[PDB]
Amino acid sequence: PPRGKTVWFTGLSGSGKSSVAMLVERKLLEKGISAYVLDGDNLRHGLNADLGFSMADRAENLRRLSHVATLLADCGHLVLVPAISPLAEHRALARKVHADAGIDFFEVFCDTPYQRPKNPDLRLTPDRSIDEQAQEVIDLLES
Amino acid sequence: PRGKTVWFTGLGSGKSSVAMLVERKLLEKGISAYVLDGDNLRHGLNADLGFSMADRAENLRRLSHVATLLADCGHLVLVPAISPLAEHRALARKVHADAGIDFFEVFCDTYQRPKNPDLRLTPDRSIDEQAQEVIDLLES
Numbered sequence: 001p002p003r004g005k006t007v008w009f010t011g012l013s014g015s016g017k018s019s020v021a022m023l024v025e026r027k028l029l030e031k032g033i034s035a036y037v038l039d040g041d042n043l044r045h046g047l048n049a050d051l052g053f054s055m056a057d058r059a060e061n062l063r064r065l066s067h068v069a070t071l072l073a074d075c076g077h078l079v080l081v082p083a084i085s086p087l088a089e090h091r092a093l094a095r096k097v098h099a100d101a102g103i104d105f106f107e108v109f110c111d112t113p114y115q116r117p118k119n120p121d122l123r124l125t126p127d128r129s130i131d132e133q134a135q136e137v138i139d140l141l142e143s
Numbered sequence: 144p145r146g147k148t149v150w151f152t153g154l155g156s157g158k159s160s161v162a163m164l165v166e167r168k169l170l171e172k173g174i175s176a177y178v179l180d181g182d183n184l185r186h187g188l189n190a191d192l193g194f195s196m197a198d199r200a201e202n203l204r205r206l207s208h209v210a211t212l213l214a215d216c217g218h219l220v221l222v223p224a225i226s227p228l229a230e231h232r233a234l235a236r237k238v239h240a241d242a243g244i245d246f247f248e249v250f251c252d253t254y255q256r257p258k259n260p261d262l263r264l265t266p267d268r269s270i271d272e273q274a275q276e277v278i279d280l281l282e283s
Binding site: 034046050060070076101 | 170188191201205208209211212213216217218238242
């Protein structure tokens, strides 16, 4: 069965990660693509209910989130992950988990101890409308 | 359209074989089935866990949530479980009920024996017939 891919959105709270991810989801579902917004905050209620909010627990939450993304992508989904992921190592580990799974991984930086990504696939900035920004993610996936 | 979980339990009892053959037959019919293997999850998602009593319980708790997540995404989730104890199965069941996902317990007979499974698979049955019995349950 077909395999999906992951778009990982990193950036400070208030940078529009969840808004953009949700609009991309809607636009992809209209396309007939099984898109899915994977939010770590939701996972915290069930799967990840053992974790707290220490830095170590946040790293672990993200490590787990990257494996849930590869699992959903293995199941065919276009996974959209809005996660602050402030450390480069958070994003590097998620990238490595995807490489090992053979799942394509796109990093989108929603720009405003946050370590700024040097080489994202796409950098979004607040001049543009959320609709425009969503279309830029869509253009990235279709390129 | 929400999926469902089939939870296979038993001792070599043919659990992973029936789970795989059901997946294959469902995939041929255009049904999005998926075999969710706890040991595979231990190499990735659950790589933080050891093998203590508490760890084995946590591994099952997490597996049950992964199943509900996948079923919520529309998959028919097939779980060749290592869940010898009744309380294990009960926890998995409760997770599914709390999520509003239908849960089917399939006992691959040959450890606390299931008292009230949806289906009992008997070892005299050719594994084509066993998988077909599972599919018939799912299609009824």
